[PDB]
Amino acid sequence: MGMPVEFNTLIVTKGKEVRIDENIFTLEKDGYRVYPMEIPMDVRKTKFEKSGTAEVQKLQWEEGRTIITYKLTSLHSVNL
Amino acid sequence: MGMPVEFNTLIVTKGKEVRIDENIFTLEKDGYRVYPMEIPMDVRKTKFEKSGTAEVQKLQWEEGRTIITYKLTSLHSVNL
Amino acid sequence: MGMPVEFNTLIVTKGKEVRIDENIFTLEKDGYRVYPMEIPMDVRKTKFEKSGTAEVQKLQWEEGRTIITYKLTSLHSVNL
Amino acid sequence: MGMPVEFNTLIVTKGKEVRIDENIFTLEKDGYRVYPMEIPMDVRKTKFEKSGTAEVQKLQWEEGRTIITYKLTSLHSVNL
């Protein structure tokens, strides 16, 4: 018994995200996570500023892990 | 933001439940748990015979713990 | 924002389940549902008559719908 | 008979919040909501700017409604 899940309000890519297309990426997290779907949210490299905005297109759970596929809709402080 | 919760489908009272009225009890669990509300579910003393059926009337989270108030709607193998 | 989900404790196949292998099936539900993972639960044709027991191996969300892949571990009243 | 809940990442007080002490308020929402606990989040009057930061101290569910008690830790654009 006991179905544990984690609710996330932000996409934090530890530089481990993978692009499968032009603006859509995939991120694999440990544990069963719940991410707002179709809703725009903040994306960042580290838990600590803002790297951009994105919207999860798909979310799946399998073997204690969760992998999301999101569409990056904008970049924040893009230097230079 | 790393908000962990546990989903429970059954009420497991380690004999630590407290009755506040005639058929309604209160159970305190460790961690923020999610219990089906207004929905009837099984209640047992341990992981090892159905003790009855109940329905959560109230659920609260506070200081890493969760305390529920349920209404016992029936008893199972009530021995003589 | 507002991220709505539904917590299910049982697998109710309206006869709309599809087997992709020998004992593993796939069921598509409306809305983003949360099902206990790796945990055994009851499976029935309708909300009325247990058909068997199963365990969800994978769960995914996409376009307001949820599709689960479960492994049937046993059959209940298998008539002859 | 599913168990529907809504995940919120921000406190949106439609001007319907009530203070029970000096810096702690209480907000009643429709539906069973899940709010990050002990974790600081943004608070605003409407879904439109930032009114301050707060941290939920208690959360309860009862009769399809949810009422939270949060501690306001700071004010944003406090005019004058």
For residue B4, the Cα-to-chain-centroid distance in whole angstroms is 19
- For chain A, how big is the Rg over CA atoms in Å? 13
Chain C residue with Cα closest to B39: C9
Q: How far is A26 from chain C (nearest CA, A)?
A: 14
Q: D57-61, long-range: CB within 8 Å, 24+ apart, which pairs?
A: D57/B62, D57/D24, D58/B60, D58/B61, D58/B62, D59/B60, D59/B61, D59/B62, D59/D33, D59/D35, D60/B58, D60/B59, D60/B60, D60/B61, D61/B37, D61/B58, D61/B59, D61/B60, D61/D32
Domain that holds residue A70: 2-76
Q: Which subunits sit against D, judged by 3+ Cβ pairs under 8 A?
A: A, B, C
Counted domains in chain C: 1
The structure was resolved to a resolution in Å of 2.7
CATH code, domain with D71: 2.40.240.20
User: In 3D, which of A34, C35, B72 has the Cα closest to residue D2?
Assistant: C35
Instruction: Report d(CA D27, CA C60) in Å as an integer.
Output: 33
- For chain D, how big is the Rg over CA atoms in Å? 13
Chain B residue with Cα closest to A36: B1
Q: How far is D80 from chain A (nearest CA, A)?
A: 29
Which neighbouring-strand residues pair with C41? Answer: C54
B7 and C41 within 8 Å at the Cβ level: the answer is: no
Chain B residue with Cα closest to D57: B62
Q: HSE-up of B5 (CA within 13 Å, CB side)?
A: 25
The helix (run of H) or strand (run of E) holding residue A34 is strand A33-34
